[PDB]
């Protein structure tokens, strides 16, 4: 139950890591895929995932199951903290403040561009991330 941009990334990553294109991926590549999706699990969670996937004795993950795993893994993240680390990329001197003019440039120029109006309902990092969530 995520955004369309996230689902699209999930579908292409699944497709890319489906080497022989039979519609399922080996659990052996689950670690690399999750890494590419910016939500690599802990060495404990991945073991719990390998054991959780080994219950039925099928180590081929089809997209329905794959989406379920990514969904709860992504939800097993601190949204406030992830956003914090994001702003922390545009603070190079390390003082805890990012430029305002810079944030407006990147979010409308690169990535999944936001439109000027949507960024204008959106500087102090620790605080900004704190109150946006």
């Amino acid at each position: 139950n995520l955004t369309e941009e996230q689902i699209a990334e999930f579908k292409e990553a699944f497709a890319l890591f489906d080497k022989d294109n039979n519609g399922s991926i080996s659990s052996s590549e689950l670690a690399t895929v999750m890494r590419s999706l910016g939500l690599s699990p802990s060495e404990a969670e991945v073991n719990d995932l390998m054991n959780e996937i080994d219950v039925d004795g099928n180590h081929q993950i089809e997209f329905s199951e794959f989406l379920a795993l990514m969904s709860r893994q992504l939800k097993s993240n601190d949204s406030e903290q992830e956003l914090l680390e994001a702003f922390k990329v545009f603070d190079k001197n390390g003082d805890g403040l990012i430029s305002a003019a810079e944030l407006k440039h990147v979010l409308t120029s690169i990535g999944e561009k936001l439109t000027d109006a949507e960024v204008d309902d959106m500087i102090n990092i620790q605080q900004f991330a704190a109150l946006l969530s």
């Binding site: 955004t3 941009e5 996230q6 699209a8 990334e9 579908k11 292409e12 990553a13 699944f14 497709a15 890319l16 489906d18 080497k19 022989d20 294109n21 039979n22 519609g23 399922s24 690399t32 890494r35 590419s36 999706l37 910016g38 690599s40 081929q60 089809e62 997209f63 329905s64 199951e65 949204s79 992830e82 956003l83 680390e85 994001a86 702003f87 990329v89 545009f90 990147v106 979010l107 690169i110 990535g111 999944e112 561009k113 936001l114 949507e118 959106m122 946006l132 969530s133």
Partner: protein
């Protein structure tokens, strides 16, 4: 429900198994056909180029060649070195390049500044320097001709003749595949076309052939539970269907259509003149297979419900059909015998509406096209090919004695020697008149072929693609010293399955195109609103482009919207709309010389006009039979030039992405072995391997670059003393973009 395919794709050593022998028989004399090896010959030419660079440096003639060509040489040598593992060869290449670099930073220092901007962006900076019409300046060949003062071998001469259009055809595999992939990116103005003494050279098909000749032979394995593998015993048709003349609705072909109380349709398919029973049992079993697996495969078509397969007395069939006004024509199709096999099934009314039916509004057409395109390509992934969706022929004049049997080849340039353009389509609207694409989805499912029959010397492939399976002959290929005819084409015996796989993809989309055009002509023929006619043709162009992007999405996982952007870098939807509307309607038959030229200028813009000597037929246009319109004049090419570019762009994006992914994971395995310790080497080598993986990521695919950035962070932690000034810029770009993504997505 678990959604996945009963088909698996990998690689094998060769397709050249149980093929016709590589021999051409000419007037009783058997001429053996030999392959010219692609990779070995390519490498020989690059070696000669390197020795030519050596002579250029010694000659101190560098002052005499334009700066853009010096930059190309330098950037290519730097890209070549970075792709060369052997440290001796690598340093040999870097030594040949240093004199050029020394020269540039002194006499052409603004060009030198740009060179380092690209070097700081990529490990194969030559690919970004040739994202434009510089790719048409064949600097490598020009250097070889100026400094290699001796003849080329026959193999080499044959290579450069086929691949004269651009230096990229000499690049080693990863650099070519990466160049080809990024040449579609949004900062690329590269178009495989340049002008030649007023004559225009189109070499889009050459891009695909240079790619395919580098690939490994593919292999498809079907699961044991697959329709073509699992042993499903004889059909148990305990149930019969009582035909009543009062319920008969109409006849289409050999199929009796009966009404039901539920307002769907019961259909009785009756044996053709020379149709075996198997053809009817096969359609029954395929329908049952697709209904059973409809959820697994996410088949969107409204599938027919198979009911029975049993024998019926002719006399009974003739008694119930004798009312309909199709009676006489139906009698001519059914088998003469008095005991006729039949196939009974139930289907909605929309199953009998052909996808070109002019009574559909544009919104219903679009949805039905999407369903057909979807199912065609998911079922291709399932390992099922439909080679008889339509009856597209290039010609009927020499039909039986033609190697191609007159059947149209959507990628003819790749499947034959010295064929440069898609040819005339004979009676193009008639080809799709009874197309097996319907308002409801797919139909006529028993005329199917396992995908593996395209990778072997099946009856199908032997009948229609004998030239490709046998080899290339042309008088210019004859080597009198050996008495053999040599060509790069004969090398395709080993890879021909890869070629037919892509031809199937282009053929499906050609069927879609003709179906759309048949709809377009019929719905706009009696329209008096002229701007509205154009709007329909405009939207049909959108639907075609969208269908091509959907096919790419289904075969590669590339998001549909990016696939469309990639296609539109290469194919011009405006030209396509103008060309389809112009040539697929009869209006042009009413024009004279000066008006035709002006109209042609508008639909080809800068490119050459379509030339023909044919005498147009009034109210039809180009027509060999004087009744049905053709696409193209006699013995000439199809005028739908942008369509050809679009089909090649589609299959080149599919195949090029498949090979790009293969290079990406080869390099990824290498990066992970360096980061783990399996391969112990210095920090710069580690940084280089990771930077190269960045070059092998899909254009526009961020998560791939996120992964590569993560490898780069890990690499910096593994070599914490190593200077990283030469790589931080490009990865900081990825880092800031990545950070932007997370912020953007949270707001959503």
């Amino acid at each position: 429900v678990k959604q996945y395919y009963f088909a698996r794709r990998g690689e094998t050593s060769t397709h050249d198994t149980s093929l016709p022998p590589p021999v051409k028989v000419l007037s009783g004399r058997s001429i053996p056909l030999k392959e010219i090896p692609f990779e070995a010959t390519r490498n020989e030419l690059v070696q000669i180029y390197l020795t030519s660079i050596d002579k250029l440096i010694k000659s101190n003639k560098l002052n005499s060649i334009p700066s853009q060509q010096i930059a190309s040489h330098y950037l290519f040598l730097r890209s070549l070195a970075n792709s060369e593992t052997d440290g001796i060869k690598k340093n040999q290449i870097l030594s040949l390049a240093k004199p050029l670099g020394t020269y540039l930073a002194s006499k052409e220092p603004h060009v030198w500044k740009m060179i380092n901007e690209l070097i700081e962006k990529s490990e194969y900076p030559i690919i970004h320097y040739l994202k434009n019409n510089r790719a048409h300046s064949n600097f490598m060949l020009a250097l070889i001709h100026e400094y290699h003062k001796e003849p080329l071998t026959k193999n080499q001469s044959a290579f450069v003749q086929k691949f004269r259009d651009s230096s990229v055809f000499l690049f080693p595999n990863p650099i070519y595949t990466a160049w080809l992939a990024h040449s579609y990116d949004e900062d690329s103005s590269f178009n495989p076309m340049f002008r030649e003494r007023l004559s225009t050279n189109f070499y889009h098909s050459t891009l695909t052939d240079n790619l395919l000749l580098r690939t490994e032979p593919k292999e498809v394995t079907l699961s044991s539970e697959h329709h073509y593998k699992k042993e499903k015993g004889p059909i148990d048709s305990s149930f019969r269907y009582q035909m009543s003349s009062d319920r008969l609705l109409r006849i289409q072909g050999r199929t009796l259509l009966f009404s039901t109380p539920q307002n769907d349709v019961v259909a009785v398919k009756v044996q053709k003149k020379g149709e075996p029973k198997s053809t009817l049992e096969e359609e029954f079993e395929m329908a049952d297979y697709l209904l059973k697996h409809q959820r697994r495969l996410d088949v969107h078509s409204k599938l027919p419900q198979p009911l029975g397969q049993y024998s019926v007395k002719k006399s009974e069939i003739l008694e119930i059909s004798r009312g309909s006004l199709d009676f006489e024509r139906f009698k001519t199709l059914i088998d003469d015998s008095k005991d006729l096999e039949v196939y009974v099934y139930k289907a909605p009314q929309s199953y009998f509406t052909y996808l070109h039916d002019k009574n559909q509004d544009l919104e219903d057409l679009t949805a039905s096209v999407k369903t057909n395109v979807h199912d065609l390509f998911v079922l291709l992934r399932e390992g099922i090919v439909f080679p008889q969706l339509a009856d597209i022929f290039h010609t009927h004049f020499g039909e039986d004695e033609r190697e191609d049997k007159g059947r149209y080849q959507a990628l003819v340039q790749l499947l034959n020697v010295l064929q440069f353009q898609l040819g005339r389509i004979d009676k193009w609207q008639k080809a799709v008149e009874y197309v097996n694409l319907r308002s409801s989805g797919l139909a006529d499912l028993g005329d199917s072929l396992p995908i593996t029959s395209l990778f072997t010397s099946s009856d199908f492939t032997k009948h229609y693609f004998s030239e490709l399976l046998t080899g290339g002959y042309h008088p210019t290929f004859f080597d009198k010293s050996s008495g053999t005819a040599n060509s790069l084409f004969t090398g395709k015996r080993r890879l021909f399955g890869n070629y037919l796989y892509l031809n199937t993809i282009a053929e499906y989309l050609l069927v879609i195109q003709l179906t759309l055009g048949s709809y377009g002509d019929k719905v706009t023929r009696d329209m008096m609103d002229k701007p509205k006619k154009e709007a329909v043709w405009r939207e049909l162009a959108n639907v075609m482009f969208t269908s091509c992007a959907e096919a790419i999405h289904i075969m590669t996982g590339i998001p549909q919207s990016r696939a469309l952007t990639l296609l539109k870098q290469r194919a011009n939807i405006e030209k396509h709309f103008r060309q389809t509307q112009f040539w697929m309607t009869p209006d042009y038959s009413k024009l004279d010389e000066d008006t035709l030229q002006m109209e042609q200028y508008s639909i080809y813009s800068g490119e050459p006009e379509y030339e023909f000597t044919d005498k147009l037929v009034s109210g039809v246009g180009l027509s060999v039979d004087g009744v049905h319109q053709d696409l193209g004049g006699y013995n000439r090419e199809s005028p739908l030039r942008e369509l050809e570019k679009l089909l090649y762009a589609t299959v080149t994006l599919i195949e090029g992405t498949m090979q790009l992914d293969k290079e990406f994971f080869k390099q990824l395995e290498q990066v992970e072995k360096i980061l783990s310790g399996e391969i112990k080497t210095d920090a710069n080598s580690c940084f280089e391997a990771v930077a190269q993986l960045l070059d092998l990521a899909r254009p526009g695919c961020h998560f791939q670059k996120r992964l590569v950035l993560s490898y780069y962070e890990e690499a910096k932690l593994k070599y914490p003393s190593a200077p990283t000034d030469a790589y931080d810029s490009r990865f900081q770009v990825v880092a800031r973009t990545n950070a932007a993504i997370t912020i953007q997505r949270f707001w959503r």
